[PDB]
């Protein structure tokens, strides 16, 4: 539920990706966390 970064027109936040955080992506949105994404 919001990892930390955000996926714009270049999604898949790579910093938070270490956790396996995944964004929803809709041209823009918000990267989600893990455990409680």
UniProtKB/Swiss-Prot annotation:
This is a cyclic peptide. Coiled coil: none annotated. Keywords: Disulfide bond, Knottin, Plant defense. The keyword GTP-binding does not apply. Disulfide bonds join 3-21, 7-23, 13-31. Pfam families: Cyclotide. InterPro entries: Cyclotide, Cyclotide_sf. GO terms for biological process: defense response. The presence of a 'disulfide through disulfide knot' structurally defines this protein as a knottin. Probably participates in a plant defense mechanism. Inhibits the cytopathic effects of the human immunodeficiency virus. Belongs to the cyclotide family. This is Palicourein.
